[PDB]
Design a protein around this ligand. Structure first.
Ligand SMILES: *[C@@H]1O[C@H](CO)[C@@H](O)[C@H](O)[C@H]1NC(C)=O
Ligand SMILES: [Ca+2]
Ligand SMILES: [Ca+2]
Ligand SMILES: [Ca+2]
Ligand SMILES: [Cl-]
Ligand SMILES: [Cl-]
Lengths: 267, 265
């Protein structure tokens, strides 16, 4: 039994591993290790391919999705794994396992500013900060920033800067560009805290740090086909790997704080 | 119309008794009740609630049977179980949980005015009684953590030495309501759901207690259904929708009102 796995490159969840010339691509990372653990415990083989458009996928027309979600809908893949958050729109068309890691949004910024919280960022006048335009993060801040029911003004202030002039002034086209702009200075990039944490830990110049928050609204999941017979099985083993600590060990492996950049060097 | 049988246990502010006149059935209220109400409205079912006869969440016994609400689902006396139930692998093996509708972690309830401000501070205590509910999933959590040689710091082992003293008899309590009462009295720190002890501190008549959190979240609260229940996936989808729209945040603010209540700082 061999399962067809679709993925998208994103450090440190899924990364290209060294392969000999003339031999097929290999992959490594936190999500690969989770997948391997499931394959060993459940006893299956798998083969990986990258989404032809490199996209997680969104809806274009009724039933028309691109990206990895589209690959599952058309049943070209049995499952998708990368850094995919569990959302209701995606769960209505495919079937997610229970989460194997929590997701939240963080801030990547150069070390040495007085900014230490999301509230501090929101108080900034004239400072450029933002996220990937037309992303889920963008839409999250839209919803929180236009809702009169928020207890703290923090979200309205952040959205005013992020969305300025339609999101064209302060947002970027990709996480790699956002990471690159934050390292150069005079910009703070809002994105997956796990993604920017790894970028900060491996920064050639150890020049950046990450601000997180207590607000975790979603989990990372494995996406399977609609009606897949394996979804509940994956959920059960994922709960077991969490409870034994195997997941925490893998997280420590791929987000190692010793031997890498000190994110708290300005304290 | 279609009516589901719901089993629960009382834990403030998740499920609480709301009104009980003689000649009328018990009514319930709380965060978990409002989550259940939204699912009932959206999926078109009614429901009737009863309390687990042994008042337990449920765990496995030596003959592989289960007590508590879990046992009520296995026997098919209940169609679903809801209160403040954590999704664990042992339970999911015998019942089917929705995806979580809230995150869970362990906190400490303690009187204000002590130098104890973290779990590490608590673990350093020499003379002090602190613990959790005996024979609970929280007791088993500190057992697993306290006996793990792979733990980086001695904190969990030290906590376990105090919690487990004399097989747990000395420093643990029989119920959360006993743990809360003893922390409010003083000279006892109670370890339990951060959300349960936060409500106790927010609503303290004297505003005399506080909560130490900082514990990372490993688990979620879920609704438990029978094995193979056709409603598990429908519930998960609607829960994800209630989160996405902000409705679950509104309900959390309703039942954990920070403004107008005790300052915990
Ligand atoms: C299993 O053990 C419990 C606790 O002693 C007991 O109440 C129950 O009747 C037992 N069930 C059997 C024999 O299946
Ligand atoms: Ca689905
Ligand atoms: Ca199950
Ligand atoms: Ca099923
Ligand atoms: Cl989940
Ligand atoms: Cl699920």
């Amino acid at each position: 039994l061999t399962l067809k796995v679709v993925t998208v490159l994103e450090e440190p969840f899924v990364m290209v591993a060294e392969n000999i010339l003339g031999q097929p691509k290999r992959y490594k990372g936190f999500s690969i290790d989770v997948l391997d653990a499931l394959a060993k415990a459940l006893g299956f083989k798998y083969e990986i391919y990258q989404a032809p458009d490199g996209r997680y996928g969104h809806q274009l027309h009724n039933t028309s999705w691109n990206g990895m979600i589209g690959e599952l809908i058309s049943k070209r893949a049995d499952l998708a794994i990368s850094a995919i958050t569990i959302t209701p729109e995606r769960e209505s068309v495919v079937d997610f396992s229970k989460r194997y890691m929590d997701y939240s949004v963080g801030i990547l910024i150069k070390k040495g500013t007085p900014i230490r919280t999301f509230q501090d960022l929101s108080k900034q006048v004239e400072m450029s900060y933002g996220t990937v335009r037309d992303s889920a993060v963008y839409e999250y801040f839209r919803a929180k920033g236009t809702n009169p029911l928020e207890q703290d003004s923090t979200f309205a202030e952040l959205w005013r800067t992020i969305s300025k002039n339609g999101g064209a002034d302060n947002c970027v086209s990709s996480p790699s560009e956002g990471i690159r702009k934050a390292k150069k200075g005079n910009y703070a990039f809002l994105w997956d805290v796990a993604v920017v944490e790894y970028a900060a830990l491996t920064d050639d110049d150890c020049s950046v740090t990450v601000i997180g928050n207590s607000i975790s609204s979603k989990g990372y999941g494995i996406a399977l086909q609609h009606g897949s017979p394996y979804r509940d099985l994956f959920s059960q083993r994922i709960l077991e790997l969490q409870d034994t600590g195997d997941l925490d060990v893998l997280k420590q492996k791929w987000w190692p704080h010793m031997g890498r950049c000190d994110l708290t060097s300005h304290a």
